[PDB]
Amino acid sequence: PQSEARRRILETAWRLIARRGYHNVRIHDIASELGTSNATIHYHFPSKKDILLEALRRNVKLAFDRQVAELHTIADARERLVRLVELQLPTPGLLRDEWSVWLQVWTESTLNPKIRDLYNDAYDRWYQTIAMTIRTGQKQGVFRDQDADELATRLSALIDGLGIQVLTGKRGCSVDHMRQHLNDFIEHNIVER
Amino acid sequence: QSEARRRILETAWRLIARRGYHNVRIHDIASELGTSNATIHYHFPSKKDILLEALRRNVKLAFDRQVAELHTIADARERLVRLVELQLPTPGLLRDEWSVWLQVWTESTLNPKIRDLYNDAYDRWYQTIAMTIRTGQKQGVFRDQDADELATRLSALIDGLGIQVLTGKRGCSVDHMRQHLNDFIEHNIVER
Ligand SMILES: C[N+](C)(C)CCO
Numbered sequence A: 001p002q003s004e005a006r007r008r009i010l011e012t013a014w015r016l017i018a019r020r021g022y023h024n025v026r027i028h029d030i031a032s033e034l035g036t037s038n039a040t041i042h043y044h045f046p047s048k049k050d051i052l053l054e055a056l057r058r059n060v061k062l063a064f065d066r067q068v069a070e071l072h073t074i075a076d077a078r079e080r081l082v083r084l085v086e087l088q089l090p091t092p093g094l095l096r097d098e099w100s101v102w103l104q105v106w107t108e109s110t111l112n113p114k115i116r117d118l119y120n121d122a123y124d125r126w127y128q129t130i131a132m133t134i135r136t137g138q139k140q141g142v143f144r145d146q147d148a149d150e151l152a153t154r155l156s157a158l159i160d161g162l163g164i165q166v167l168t169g170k171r172g173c174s175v176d177h178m179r180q181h182l183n184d185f186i187e188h189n190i191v192e193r
Numbered sequence B: 001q002s003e004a005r006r007r008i009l010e011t012a013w014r015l016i017a018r019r020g021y022h023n024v025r026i027h028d029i030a031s032e033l034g035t036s037n038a039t040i041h042y043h044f045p046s047k048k049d050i051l052l053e054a055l056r057r058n059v060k061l062a063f064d065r066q067v068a069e070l071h072t073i074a075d076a077r078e079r080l081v082r083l084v085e086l087q088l089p090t091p092g093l094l095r096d097e098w099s100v101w102l103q104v105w106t107e108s109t110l111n112p113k114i115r116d117l118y119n120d121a122y123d124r125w126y127q128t129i130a131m132t133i134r135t136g137q138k139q140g141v142f143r144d145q146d147a148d149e150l151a152t153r154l155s156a157l158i159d160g161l162g163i164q165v166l167t168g169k170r171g172c173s174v175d176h177m178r179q180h181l182n183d184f185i186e187h188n189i190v191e192r
């Protein structure tokens, strides 16, 4: 009843924030899209920053559930790492929108401590996932010996950089090109020769 | 009057870097300088014109800075390490520049004049890195691996690490980013 009103507001706000930008989304844009009042929205989220914070929290959870679903039947660490990286591509739809929002979060983080803390915890979880995957492939003998933390740092960084090049329209860049670049890095920098 | 626009842009640049473009109202610029929203619009008809002219000014200053630093350097390995050092978000001017760039990546995905400006700027920088790699390959100090893909890799790595710095990743610092990049150059670019 009320938890349902919240989720709908957040789902709508996420999409609007992704496609129009957080500072260009007004409360009445959300209320119009859903048929509610500005007052209902204010009741659940007294400030716009609260809509962003709670929308991010909901999405980090959705995204992690997606990850769990995609990987649970995968035991080979190369296949796991390949899938993990695939889940990070800004493919058409929800993943492209998530990227759109994360780019905004990088900036808003430099200014809002709750957003900064949420982004860091979400980042850290991913970072540990990557590092853990590396150490499994190392134990399985399919990945080269190398410090997994430095490698998780590098892979994560490479991914974010490439995504920017996709979103900002760098000439020759596409999701297929990013995919190819990242698969080349895995095959030549991570996989055991 | 060339002096009034100058002050406006330098002030707007600093406020955008520190407060964020969407949080800077026109009266905020006026108060930092002592003037009115009207005078500000007199020189910049829209808020978006302020961001655009400021960015143009910055891109130029940064390219100048780069030419001054690379001027004499013949050795490609040294040129490359210097190019990379210029991208570090060191406290003060460079960190402020990164802050604006971060906003520009987002505004690019929505505004064409800004996307155009960012792509011409990024392409210049990217070709520079490419060129330098090819130089070191010819001099014999760098591994003969496709320079476009290496430059794509190094540029992406730079952006990603900068983000980790600016957003506060645990254990991240400007010096750690420097070491990571130098290690990338030394172990991935330089010829064993
Ligand atoms: C790689 N992404 C930016 C999509 C997620 C980080 O949380």
Ligand SMILES: C[N+](C)(C)CCO
Binding pocket: B087, B097, B098, B101, B121, B122, B158, B159, B162
């Ligand atoms: C973020 N950099 C400073 C690397 C370049 C932006 O034009």
